[PDB]
Design a protein around this ligand. Structure first.
Ligand SMILES: *[C@@H]1O[C@H](CO)[C@@H](O[C@@H]2O[C@H](CO)[C@@H](O[C@@H]3O[C@H](CO)[C@@H](O)[C@H](O)[C@@H]3O)[C@H](O)[C@H]2NC(C)=O)[C@H](O)[C@H]1NC(C)=O
Ligand SMILES: *[C@@H]1O[C@H](CO)[C@@H](O[C@@H]2O[C@H](CO)[C@@H](O[C@@H]3O[C@H](CO)[C@@H](O)[C@H](O)[C@@H]3O)[C@H](O)[C@H]2NC(C)=O)[C@H](O)[C@H]1NC(C)=O
Lengths: 209, 209
């Protein structure tokens, strides 16, 4: 019955911030038919057509439709400087082509402030205690947070999604749970944050009794 | 054709004596040709007849929204009774049925901890007071920061997040002028939840060497 639908995805945050990763924008076409699987993708960067996108392997979904996907590698600095990426999709089951445009969220970046907070004394009655990392004042909301100890990632932590604050920046908390004895024995735990507005896109704060 | 949504009561409505909780059966995209909607309601399988239909509302897109509300007893909802709405309309080939109840699972009492601002935050104009609320089930909860009985103007509370033990946690961040912390004013984090004694608890935070 219904024709295809198009969704355009930004790079993953870590891909935009890590030297070792390659960020890409992903143009996804769903509900493509078996009678007309062919999809034309045209790509534009700030309105200028580009030709280095690549089509991923066509994929039949469990519901017997085709998913057709084009990916365009982006330069780290291009994405972070706010370039606009446009995908134009044509298919014979569409009456007209579909255009979508994506870019990094607009707004002046702001550096996260990272504060480690020890467990409350009242939590010391429990088997495990909570080590809290408050990350606030950041913009845009794309960010990565990890808790580590002795250079290894901790097994049991959860990070809230960024939440808009009253000044137009974002904040989050990351809660690390550890056995009480590991806190009491004086081990050092570290909260690591990646964000475009940090120096070298990275900072780390440590916490210990 | 029309679509049917069934909403539970507001969390505060379920926990406050002074409030009346209700379940709301919402029918959208009702036509002008056949605005008539029949509602049947059932409580644990047993038809009831004390629901009320809200005033019909034409929406900005020129469709009708038709809503039936059924009042629920505080104890009935917390004891997990199940509420079914059956909807009939000429533009439906078959009636639509929807059931809703308190989320299944044994309740667990929130643990509430207040965490003072980091010393590293003391060069800022304003400091962050943190309320960690963890280990609670189900996720329905309300949180508020106060001082001298009056609610605070500038706090934000994260949505509940599922933790690794199947309970929820959240943080509530209160922002105050540094001078109000430095001068020893007392702030309080108040939490309402079904598994608290009297459905309420309060924890204070202040600078007090
Ligand atoms: C057949 O199966 C595929 C795979 O499950 C379905 O594809 C999915 O289609 C929905 C839209 O109908 C897409 O939802 C979109 O997701 C994005 C990302 O969260 C969101 O931004 C959009 O607002 C929207 O929710 C979903 O991405 C897509 N999943 C995949 C893997 O491509 C397809 O709809 C099914 N077709 C039929 C007729 O059932
Ligand atoms: C015409 O305007 C009305 C009112 O703006 C639109 O009603 C909305 O319809 C959508 C689904 O079509 C409803 O979304 C649902 O919301 C619930 C709770 O947020 C969610 O659980 C569901 O999965 C879904 O997202 C939405 O509740 C409803 N809004 C209101 C005020 O009733 C309607 O869609 C428009 N109809 C047409 C033909 O344009």
């Amino acid at each position: 019955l219904g024709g295809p639908s198009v969704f355009l995805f930004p790079p993953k945050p870590k891909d935009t911030l890590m030297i070792s990763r390659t960020p890409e924008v992903t143009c996804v076409v769903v509900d493509v038919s078996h009678e007309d699987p062919e999809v034309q993708f045209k790509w534009y960067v700030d309105g200028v057509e580009v030709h280095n996108a690549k089509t991923k392997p066509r994929e039949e979904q469990f519901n017997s439709t085709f998913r057709v996907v084009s990916v365009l590698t982006v330069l780290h600095q291009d994405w972070l400087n706010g370039k606009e990426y446009k995908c134009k999709v044509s298919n014979k089951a569409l009456p007209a082509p579909i255009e979508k445009t994506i870019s990094k969220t607009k707004g002046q970046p702001r550096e996260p402030q990272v504060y480690t907070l020890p467990p409350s004394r009242e939590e010391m009655t429990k088997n495990q205690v909570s080590l809290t990392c408050l990350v606030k004042g950041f913009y845009p909301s794309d960010i990565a947070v990890e808790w580590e100890s002795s250079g290894q990632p901790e097994n049991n932590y959860k990070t809230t999604p960024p939440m808009l604050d009253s000044d137009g920046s974002f904040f989050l908390y990351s809660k690390l749970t550890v056995d009480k004895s590991r806190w009491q024995q004086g081990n050092i735990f570290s909260c690591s944050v990646m964000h475009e507005a940090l120096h070298n896109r990275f900072t780390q704060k440590s916490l210990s009794l």
